[PDB]
Amino acid sequence: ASGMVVTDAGPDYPIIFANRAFSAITGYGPDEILGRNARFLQGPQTDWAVVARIREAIAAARPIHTRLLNYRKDGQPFWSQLAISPVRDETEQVVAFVGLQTDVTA
Amino acid sequence: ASGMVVTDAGPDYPIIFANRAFSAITGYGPDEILGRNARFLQGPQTDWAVVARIREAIAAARPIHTRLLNYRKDGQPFWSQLAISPVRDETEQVVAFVGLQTDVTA
Numbered sequence A, B: 001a002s003g004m005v006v007t008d009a010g011p012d013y014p015i016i017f018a019n020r021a022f023s024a025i026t027g028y029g030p031d032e033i034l035g036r037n038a039r040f041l042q043g044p045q046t047d048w049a050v051v052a053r054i055r056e057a058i059a060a061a062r063p064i065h066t067r068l069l070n071y072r073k074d075g076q077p078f079w080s081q082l083a084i085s086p087v088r089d090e091t092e093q094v095v096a097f098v099g100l101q102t103d104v105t106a
């Protein structure tokens, strides 16, 4: 299965749920994930222009599909195919985000 | 906050995440929610025609926004404004659902 997380909405977007597949892909257990913004997976060779695109998509509540370099707990880089989408309530306000992580490393 | 759950997709759709607001609205703790299909909230005066529309929408991966009578743990009925949406993966397969529960009792 792909990794999946749920976050709160802004301004902090902490992770409130992470599936077991996300822990397998990233090397972090739930206690090392919950309450953190997902940017902790980024590292020195992550493309900061893609990170900025992600930031802007989330701020505008626009779904985004893109590929980003992330790092396992042990420091190994991997390619994450990310899909990040808002969850809206009865008045169309954004109350959470869902993220899917697919390890697309060849 | 509205209640929010995440479920797996078919054929069983068990709940894999429930927020604190869902436990406050329904009166059930997380230990008594996780692993269950959300239909446990229904009871004797729930409209079985609306339940069927929800079943059909989920089976077709169509979002549905509707109002349904549900029951708190203590037996008190309440009106739940339900919003149930699929989560799609990189090849557009449905891999989860998100549900929002807004208590709209007068």
Ligand SMILES: Cc1cc2nc3c(=O)[nH]c(=O)nc-3n(C[C@H](O)[C@H](O)[C@H](O)COP(=O)(O)O)c2cc1C
Pocket: A005, A006, A007, A013, A037, A038, A039, A041, A042, A051, A052, A054, A055, A058, A068, A070, A080, A082, A084, A085, A097, A098, A099, A100, A101
């Ligand atoms: C639901 C969700 C899931 C996310 N998953 C990841 C992820 O797996 N890897 C990642 O590098 N960033 C992920 N992000 C993006 C970061 O949380 C953050 O939005 C990004 O780094 C841009 O914001 P910043 O410039 O403040 O860091 C996710 C964000 C959300 C809302």
Ligand SMILES: Cc1cc2nc3c(=O)[nH]c(=O)nc-3n(C[C@H](O)[C@H](O)[C@H](O)COP(=O)(O)O)c2cc1C
Pocket: B005, B006, B007, B013, B037, B038, B039, B041, B042, B051, B052, B054, B055, B058, B068, B070, B080, B082, B084, B085, B097, B098, B099, B100, B101
């Ligand atoms: C994400 C999600 C959330 C749901 N939330 C509720 C809910 O709060 N209350 C409810 O009565 N049914 C809820 N349902 C609907 C039931 O799980 C089920 O789909 C419905 O009873 C129709 O199927 P059935 O005829 O097999 O019971 C939810 C379903 C999903 C997928």
